[PDB]
Amino acid sequence: YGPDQRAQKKGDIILGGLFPIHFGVAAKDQDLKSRPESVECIRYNFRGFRWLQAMIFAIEEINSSPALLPNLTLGYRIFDTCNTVSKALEATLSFVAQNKIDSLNLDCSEHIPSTIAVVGATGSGVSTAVANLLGLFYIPQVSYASSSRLLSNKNQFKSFLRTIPNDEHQATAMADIIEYFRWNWVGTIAADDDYGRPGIEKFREEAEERDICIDFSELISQYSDEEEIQHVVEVIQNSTAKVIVVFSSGPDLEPLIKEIVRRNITGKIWLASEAWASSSLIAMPQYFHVVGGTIGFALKAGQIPGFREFLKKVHPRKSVHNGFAKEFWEETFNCHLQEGRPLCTGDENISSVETPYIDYTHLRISYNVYLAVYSIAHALQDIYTCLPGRGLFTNGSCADIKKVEAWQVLKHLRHLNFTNNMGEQVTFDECGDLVGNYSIINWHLSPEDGSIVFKEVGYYNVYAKKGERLFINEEKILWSGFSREVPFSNCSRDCLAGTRKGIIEGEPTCCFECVECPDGEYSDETDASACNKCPDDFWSNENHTSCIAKEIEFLSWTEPFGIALTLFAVLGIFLTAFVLGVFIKFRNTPIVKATNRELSYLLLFSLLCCFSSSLFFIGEPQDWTCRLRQPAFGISFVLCISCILVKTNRVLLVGLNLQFLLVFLCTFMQIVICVIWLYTAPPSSYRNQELEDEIIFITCHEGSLMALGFLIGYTCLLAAICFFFAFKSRKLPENFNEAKFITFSMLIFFIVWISFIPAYASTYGKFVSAVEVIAILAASFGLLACIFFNKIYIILFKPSRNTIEEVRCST
């Protein structure tokens, strides 16, 4: 036979089942000093007993109806695995015992029944160990809870089927949930078995595609010792990540949760996989301050109508075929059953004690057990109603229901398609898998009772296009059980505008510093990895949020220095017009006729042009003022020097009038120099940007310096010749000491235009035009004063008629 505690019943066709009635086995490390005994199972599991009852209720309901398998009863043989590979293998060796006597040729009870199909285990490692042995004899195994991706491999597992989705959609959904709430800094914890490792590897692969940085990654187990648990707890406690993604079940997560609760570590955001998101080992009222507000996945519910009334009929004396009912009665009512702790009577009421057996709201894994039994029954009904010539075997032949074999049932299970009680269609794919939606739940705290309440906050729709599968209603979520604000789980705070992301070495790419943008660059947005250089005509604001236009610099009108220069120029023009009016008003008087009368008019006109030529420097330096600011002053002032130079004594030793030829031939050189310079290479405007970054100047580009050198040197040469021929005869008393005044005027010229040299070599912006204008007006006021003011003071001032006569002029 096999294990002695079982639920079995005879029939024409026998099914097999494997359920965890205990949570684990007793902790005993054997030292092998004596022959090893059988291990004992410890903690009773009411949920697994309900799953076993779901299988038995399905079998009895199928045998009741006359439409699903007429005149042919099903039987069963069900064992207990205790979530352990070894006990499951001791059961599976009894399943395959008749097949294996044939294959190993041992020929001896000869009344051993044969098992057609087995309802599978809950854990993936247990399912792999059972599947390796059931695939040898082609016995089909349908699992209700194993969801590892490794069991989709049909090269290794030839006869495995399941009614639960595999876990790739769940890890993708976890990555989508993390992307929805805009986190990037997470930690991961998985169980060290075939369920946790592929799930957490698939989560890691999906997480690096979405730029989510994982801080830590640790493995746990039910049989971890103490120092591994303090290593994992110290890894959790050292990290700044708040969101932790866990692939585990209840038994593998319980020691870690107990040690975290003992140290009272709060503030973490847990992401549960489906195995522990509804686990009564973890959803405890005294753990809540650690595990409140846990967000998890759940399967879709289903309706089994007469099931609760079947569940309330269990009894130790009336369940002859069920052998697990006795310990159920003992563990519910805390008594001892004395077959024929206080002593039981067998009369107690199941509703009086609250256990997970009938305290439930939805049926989720129990529905998978129900559907597995109906899948096997509709495969056998497909065999029963097969028509000759239309079968699934050679030449369209049909199997015999009276001598059916397991490989033919597996063949009909691969081509299976049927409608359940809820109206949906059930079909397995080529990998032997089934697909379904997910519900998304949150852990709350009951106000009526003080216990944990699972509230649905969203769904995950697996038939939708990628990136459109998640729905979450955020207004129904209490973070950490009580808070209404979404928590912060990034590595570092976001950089603002005006700054830039900087690397921290040895750390992942989600962790950065915020460095301010440099002097000439902005940053427009938040979380900028670079600073953008501002355009040529604009310079960055001090805030560095955005940049504004530069400041243009030029000496201008409507400026409190240019107004002063303009008023001085107008005063000079008014003075020259006054002197011209005085000379015209008395032109038959001897003082003006003793001087050359026809020649002073050109002198006064040249002084008028010299005053008016200084206005070209003031203002915005356009193109046609840079071309005429120097030649106008050059020509006008050389005309002035020539008109001075003719009227000196002893400089006319050698046409109709013979004094204007000297003036014409001395002005003609400046005229031709200006014409050839302005023809070969004219000056231009120039926007100067290389002196200061913040401001730009508007200046005049000269074009050449050879022609400007000639145009200054010729004027200095004429000034030197006139100064020589005036200083040589300075003692002559004629014309009211005129040669002395010519000497003083040329001296003032040379002092001003030597003393204004070092302004040019040092100043660079507005001040150059200022010192040019001040120099021009200073030189021309000096020349006008020194030539004419003594003559004016004699003509009309208080010595009016006394010193005006011709006999006084040369005395």
Ligand X SMILES: C[C@@H](NCCCc1cccc(C(F)(F)F)c1)c1cccc2ccccc12
Ligand Y SMILES: *[C@@H]1O[C@H](CO)[C@@H](O[C@@H]2O[C@H](CO)[C@@H](O)[C@H](O)[C@H]2NC(C)=O)[C@H](O)[C@H]1NC(C)=O
Q: Could you say which of 463, 465, 658, 679 contacts ligand Y (CB under 6 A)?
A: 463
Q: Which of 310, 316, 306, 264 is nearest to 287 (CA)?
A: 264
Kindly tell me which residue out of 44, 181, 287, 407 binds a copy of itself, with binding defined by CB under 8 A.
407
Smallest gap from residue 458 Cβ to ligand Y (A): 10
Binding mask 488-527 for a copy of itself (x = CB under 8 A): -------------xxxxxxxxx--x--x--xx-------x
Q: Which does 234 bind (CB under 5 to 8 A by kind): Ca ion, a copy of itself, ligand NAG, none?
A: ligand NAG
Residue number, 274 or 433, with CB nearest to ligand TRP: 274
Give SS3 for 651: coil
Residue from 244, 275, 409, 477 in contact with ligand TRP (CB under 6 A): 275
* 147 annotated ligand binder: yes
Long-range Cβ contacts of 213-216 (<8 Å, 24+ apart): 213/184, 213/185, 213/186, 213/491, 213/508, 213/509, 213/510, 213/511, 214/186, 214/187, 214/188, 215/185, 215/186, 215/187, 215/239, 215/240, 215/241, 216/187, 216/188, 216/241
Contact status, residue 375 vs residue 163, Cβ threshold 8 Å: yes
Q: How far is CA 384 from CA 61, 68, 72, in A?
A: 18, 10, 10
* DSSP-derived secondary structure for 309-376: HHHTT--TTT-SSBSSHHHHHHHHHT-B------B--S---GGGS--TTT--S--SHHHHHHHHHHHH
| Residue 427 binds ligand NAG, judged by CB under 6 A | yes
235 binds ligand NAG (CB under 6 A): yes
**Three-class SS state of 442:** strand
Least gap, CB of 507 to Ca ion (angstroms)? 6
Which residue from 280, 355, 490, 589 is in contact with ligand Y, where contact means CB under 6 A?
490
How many whole angstroms separate alpha carbon 476 and alpha carbon 409? 47
Q: Which of 237, 240, 397, 532 binds a copy of itself (CB under 8 A)?
A: 397
Among residue numbers 603 through 632, which ones bind ligand X (CB under 6 A)? Answer: 630
Question: Which residue matches tokens 């020097």?
Answer: 641
**C-alpha to C-alpha distance for 14 and 73, rounded to whole angstroms:** 9
Alpha helices in 243-285 (DSSP H): 250-263
Asked if 122 touches ligand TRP (CB under 6 A), the answer is yes
Q: Six-digit token pair at 773?
A: 């204008």
Residue 646: phi and psi, rounded to 5, are -70, -40
- Nearest to residue 99, comparing CAs of 305, 407, 436, 482? 407
Q: Which amino acid belongs to residue 467?
A: G
Residue (of 125, 13, 124) closest to 63 by Cα position: 13
Where does this chain touch ligand Y (CB under 6 A) — which range of 13-21, 178-186, 722-730, 790-798? 178-186
Question: DSSP assignment, residue 209?
Answer: T
410 binds, among a copy of itself, ligand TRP, Ca ion, none (CB under 5 to 8 A by kind): a copy of itself
Q: What angle do CA 736, 598, 720 make, to 5 degrees?
A: 60
Binding-site partner at residue 612 among a copy of itself, ligand Y, Ca ion, none, CB < 5 to 8 Å by type: none
Nearest residue (CB) to ligand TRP, 269 versus 365: 365
Q: Would you count residue 772 as binding ligand X (CB under 6 A)?
A: yes
Question: Which among 21-29, 74-82, 144-152, 286-294 is the span making contact with ligand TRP, rule CB under 6 A?
Answer: 144-152
Single residue of 234, 519, 524, 620 touching ligand NAG by CB under 6 A = 234
Instruction: Tell the smallest beta-carbon distance from residue 328 to ligand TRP (Å).
Output: 18
Angle at 177 between CA 174 and CA 182, to 5 degrees: 130
Q: How many helices (H) and strands (E) does the chain have?
A: 24, 25
Considering only residues 63 to 82 of the shown chain, the ones binding Ca ion according to CB under 5 A are: 65, 69
- Per-position x/- string for 237-266, each x denoting binding to ligand NAG as judged by CB under 6 A, each - no binding: -x-------------------------x-x
Asked if 506 interacts with Ca ion (CB under 5 A), we say: yes
223 binds a copy of itself (CB under 8 A): yes
> Whole-number minimum distance, CB 713 to ligand X, in Å?
8
3-state secondary structure of 515: strand
- In the complex, the smallest distance separating the C-beta of residue 582 from ligand X, rounded to whole angstroms, is 29
If binding is defined by CB under 6 A, does position 249 make contact with ligand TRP?
yes
Alpha carbons 247 and 201: distance in angstroms, whole number = 10
Count interface residues toward a copy of itself (CB under 8 A). 76
Q: Is residue 688 classed as helix, strand or coil in its secondary structure?
A: strand
Residues 362-381 that bind ligand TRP (CB under 6 A): 365
Instruction: Report yes or no: 49 and 21 within 8 Å, Cβ to Cβ.
Output: yes
Q: Which is nearer to ligand Y, 428 or 616 (CB)?
A: 428
Query: Residues 6 or more apart from 379 whose CB is under 8 A from it?
Result: 409, 412, 413, 416
Q: Whose CA is closest to 617, among 569, 574, 679?
A: 569
- Residue 519 touches ligand NAG, criterion: CB under 6 A: no
What track of x and - describes contact with ligand X for positions 629 through 668 (by CB under 6 A)? Answer: -x--xx----------------------------------
683 known member of a binding site:
no
Nearer to ligand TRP, 236 or 283 (CB): 283
Compute the least distance from the CB of residue 641 to ligand NAG, in Å: 51
Sole binder of ligand X in the list 393, 574, 664, 760 (CB under 6 A): 760
Q: How far apart are CA 674 and CA 634, in angstroms?
A: 9
Residue 492 assigned as binding residue: no
x-marked contacts with ligand X along 708-747 as a string, rule CB under 6 A: xx-xx--xx-------------------------------
Q: In 10 A of CB 476, how many CB atoms?
A: 12
Residue closer to ligand Y by CB (options 424, 734) is 424
Task: Give the shortest CB-364-to-ligand TRP separation in angstroms.
Answer: 8
* Residue 29 assigned to a binding site: no
Angle between helices 767-795 and 738-755 (to 10 degrees): 170
End-to-end CA distance of the chain: 164
64 annotated ligand-binding residue = no
69 is in an annotated binding site: yes
Site residues (CB under 8 A) for a copy of itself, limited to 93-122 = 93-94, 97, 100-101, 103-109, 112
Task: Decide: is 554 part of the binding site for ligand NAG (CB under 6 A).
Answer: no
| Interacting partner of 184 out of ligand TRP, ligand NAG, ligand Y, none (Cβ under 5 to 8 A depending on kind) | ligand Y
Helices (H), 150-239: 168-180, 196-208, 226-237
184 binds ligand Y (CB under 6 A): yes
Instruction: Tell me: does residue 318 bind ligand Y (CB under 6 A).
Output: no
SS3 81: coil
Stretch that binds ligand NAG, among 234-242, 622-630, 695-703, 750-758 (CB under 6 A): 234-242
3 state SS of 252: helix
| Total residues at interface with ligand Y (CB under 6 A) | 11
Q: How far is the CB of 363 from ligand Y (least distance, A)?
A: 16
Binding site for ligand NAG (CB under 6 A): 234-235, 238, 264, 266, 289, 417, 425, 427, 436-437, 459, 461, 463, 542-543, 545
Binding site for ligand Y (CB under 6 A): 179, 182, 184, 211, 437, 459, 461, 463, 488, 490, 494
Binding site for ligand X (CB under 6 A): 630, 633-634, 705, 708-709, 711-712, 715-716, 753-754, 756-757, 760, 772, 776
Q: Which residues are annotated as a binding site for spermine?
A: 215, 217
Q: Which residues are annotated as a binding site for phosphate?
A: 47-51, 364-366
Binding site for ligand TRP (CB under 6 A): 122-124, 145-148, 195, 249, 274-275, 365
